Design a protein around this ligand. Sequence first.
Ligand SMILES: *[C@@H]1O[C@H](CO)[C@@H](O[C@@H]2O[C@H](CO)[C@@H](O)[C@H](O)[C@H]2NC(C)=O)[C@H](O)[C@H]1NC(C)=O
Ligand SMILES: *[C@@H]1O[C@H](CO)[C@@H](O)[C@H](O)[C@H]1NC(C)=O
Ligand SMILES: [Zn+2]
Length: 379
Amino acid sequence: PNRAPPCDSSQCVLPDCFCSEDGTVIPGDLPARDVPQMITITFDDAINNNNIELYKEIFNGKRKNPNGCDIKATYFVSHKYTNYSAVQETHRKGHEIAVHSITHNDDERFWSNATVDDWGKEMAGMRVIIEKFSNITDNSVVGVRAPYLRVGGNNQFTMMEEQAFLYDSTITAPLSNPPLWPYTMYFRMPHRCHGNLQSCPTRSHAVWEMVMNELDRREDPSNDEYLPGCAMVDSCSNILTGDQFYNFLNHNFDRHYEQNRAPLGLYFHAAWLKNNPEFLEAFLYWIDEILQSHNDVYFVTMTQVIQWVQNPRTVTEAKNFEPWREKCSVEGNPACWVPHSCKLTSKEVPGETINLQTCLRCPVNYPWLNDPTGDGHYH
Ligand SMILES: *[C@@H]1O[C@H](CO)[C@@H](O[C@@H]2O[C@H](CO)[C@@H](O)[C@H](O)[C@H]2NC(C)=O)[C@H](O)[C@H]1NC(C)=O
Ligand SMILES: *[C@@H]1O[C@H](CO)[C@@H](O)[C@H](O)[C@H]1NC(C)=O
Ligand SMILES: [Zn+2]
């Protein structure tokens, strides 16, 4: 069929398209020593009072990138139990909001075999929920990450192109040295389809892939002992102490910083940090140590990585790069002082009553797959 061809650097030109033969080449062929080391901290799943205080402790308005702006993270938000006033405030503070589906269906075979329409209802539907109940009007909800990192073959990416999503961050790249830069899906993936029973795209799709490089979990990377990598931090099951986590962060930082400076992805679940105080303590110690010692390291959103790829800036130029200064150091007031607490039901979620907090008036129905606005209208 129309299998995407291997990367052709002649018809894949910035800013629409970026590829290299193995995914390790730096955009714009900048020297590695002049490339800012980007770090994309991300958090999956619901934003609510289970984790709102954790995010305040991390993103305290005192941790700043070398451009003077607050460090920024990306939230892949799933619908159930999410507080949309909190999503709105997180966005107001300059963090990126992306979608992680409505249902977070735990049947992994559903995702790997879902139709284009199924992917659309889950992901475009979740975008509708966020844009409405968090009142986000600037079309900045543009990223997708699938539950359980289940890639949806071509169907997922056909959906994302039809729905005008900017990027996916579901595809894992096996532990590699050097690690991989993001790539667009117009051309063949520069690495194997990785993971149990994974179905990866094969055709050309006008979608960016914020590829998830596995991290090296080896406690002593000096051997030649071989261990599978890990993409989600909490899937690195040998990390048991704060000291191990601290060394793990340094080792994988160095892997990126000392090679091709590919963006380093630190992909979290809030609960993993919250339930393990020594991990949170080690993480913050590490962040603060990296920020003080590096004038060339930026904690940025996923969209901000793509913006750099589209217009590569050296470390010196990065200080005044305007996309990285959007919502530089937001203070101000929340969109509403006391959000509505909506107790909602829906025949799509039979039995449950789910509280949804929003600055908007409560909808008549609990939003779900077949009614993402919660308006209860007939179709
Ligand atoms: C939902 O999230 C919002 C936003 O963080 C929380 O809103 C706070 O609500 C209290 C009410 O006691 C107000 O005093 C604050 O001004 C609000 N904060 C902001 C930043 O607007 C709300 O408490 C959350 N509710 C639940 C149930 O999770
Ligand atoms: C969304 O935010 C704008 C900007 O503050 C505000 O004027 C508008 O009323 C909000 N929309 C809704 C439906 O609350
Ligand atoms: Zn999830």
